[PDB]
Design a binder for this molecule. Structure first.
Ligand SMILES: COc1cc([C@@H](C(=O)N2CCCC[C@H]2C(=O)OCc2cnn(C)c2)C2CCCCC2)cc(OC)c1OC
Length: 128
């Protein structure tokens, strides 16, 4: 399914080239502009453990998920990944534990050493 496709075909968008954050563009966005650190960003997303034991959606409250980019308000893989996206874009990310919740995890919700998968739609981004 979606996670395996990203494993075998996804682009490694880490600085370190450690395959910690892999990305496939599923729908192309508008213009050339991607968000800057500190930009207010607006998304819709679905996410899951790659196990599939826990699943999560902004769609399951009909209201976009909003955060300031590059401030570590979200896991590192999102600050990396959403920074590569254009307004209108839909992307898939597959994320190793080092760029998500690590060896500590986030119990009881996220186990130790969990791999995560997200589908993300970048709706909009606005300056600080
Ligand atoms: C551990 O707590 C939670 C985790 C999650 C889900 C998750 O991992 N994310 C949610 C969207 C942004 C990326 C990432 C994250 O940075 O989340 C921490 C967080 C949430 N709100 N803010 C501002 C930052 C998980 C959920 C299980 C399936 C895999 C993704 C969502 C949470 O609540 C909606 C959450 O509780 C706070």
């Amino acid at each position: 399914g979606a996670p395996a496709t990203v494993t075998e075909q996804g682009e490694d968008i880490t600085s370190k080239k450690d395959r910690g954050v892999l990305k496939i563009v599923k729908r192309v966005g508008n213009g050339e502009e991607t968000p800057m650190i500190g930009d207010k960003v607006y998304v819709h997303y679905k996410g899951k453990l790659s196990n599939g034991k826990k699943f999560d959606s902004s769609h399951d409250r009909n209201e976009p998920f909003v955060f300031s980019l590059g401030k570590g308000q979200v896991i590192k893989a999102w600050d990396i990944g959403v920074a590569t996206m254009k307004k209108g874009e839909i992307a898939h990310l597959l994320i190793k534990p080092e760029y998500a919740y690590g060896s500590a995890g986030s119990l009881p919700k996220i186990p130790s050493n969990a791999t995560l998968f997200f589908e993300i739609e970048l709706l909009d981004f606005k300056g600080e």
